[PDB]
């Protein structure tokens, strides 16, 4: 995806669930077809609100008590040329917001075209067979964060290479506190 509009979400896209224990009672053959039909128009309603803002990349936060993304919502989202990225932890939301400058969204009525963070390129890289990786580069509103990728041949060399870099960061930290 080129010239993407990233958006953070903290709510789920599945069948409606309330905090109180709820259940749906069916006592007629005509109501069976309505449950499926009215369910399908609820997920479709939320997907059509996202495309109105002009979103290309989606970031879903991890949820454990209820499903965060059903197979129906993913089927609709692919048809609108949107990248979906699931399973984001709750501890690294701040680092994401500090890098691309993305307002978190926790309610559908607050999903406005200003709650979005722009970027230049957002594409996934493929290694030589060690896995895949995600790189988002060229942020319109960059912060004061940076990241380093460490490469090695063995699991022992990577660990020693990582500790050596962490030592070269503490020496630069010492120079700013006592310029001597």
């Amino acid at each position: 995806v080129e010239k993407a509009k990233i958006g953070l979400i903290q709510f789920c896209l599945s069948a409606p669930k309330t905090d109180m224990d709820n259940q749906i009672v069916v006592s007629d053959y005509a109501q069976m077809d309505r449950v499926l039909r009215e369910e399908r128009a609820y997920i479709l309603n939320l997907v059509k609100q996202i495309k109105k803002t002009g979103c290309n990349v989606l970031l879903i936060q991890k949820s454990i008590l209820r499903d965060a993304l059903s197979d129906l919502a993913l089927h609709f989202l692919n048809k609108m040329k949107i990248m979906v990225i699931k399973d984001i932890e709750r501890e690294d939301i701040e680092f994401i917001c500090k890098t691309i400058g993305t307002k978190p969204v926790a309610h559908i009525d607050q999903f406005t075209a200003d709650m979005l963070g722009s970027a230049e390129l957002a594409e996934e890289v493929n290694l030589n067979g060690s896995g895949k990786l995600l790189k988002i580069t060229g942020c319109a509103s960059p912060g004061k964060t940076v990241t380093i990728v460490v490469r090695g041949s063995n699991k022992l060399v990577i660990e020693e290479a990582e500790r050596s870099i962490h030592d070269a960061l503490c020496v630069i930290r010492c120079l700013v506190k006592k310029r001597a």
């Binding site: 749906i24 069916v26 053959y29």
Partner: peptide, 26 residues
């Protein structure tokens, strides 16, 4: 079949055959 949150409660015996027939018709 119905999901975990959807149950079937019948109060009139006459509306039972139509419901059972609709499981194999969808």
């Amino acid at each position: 079949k119905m999901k975990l949150g959807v149950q079937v409660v019948i109060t009139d015996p006459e509306k039972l055959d139509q419901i059972r027939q609709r499981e194999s018709d969808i």
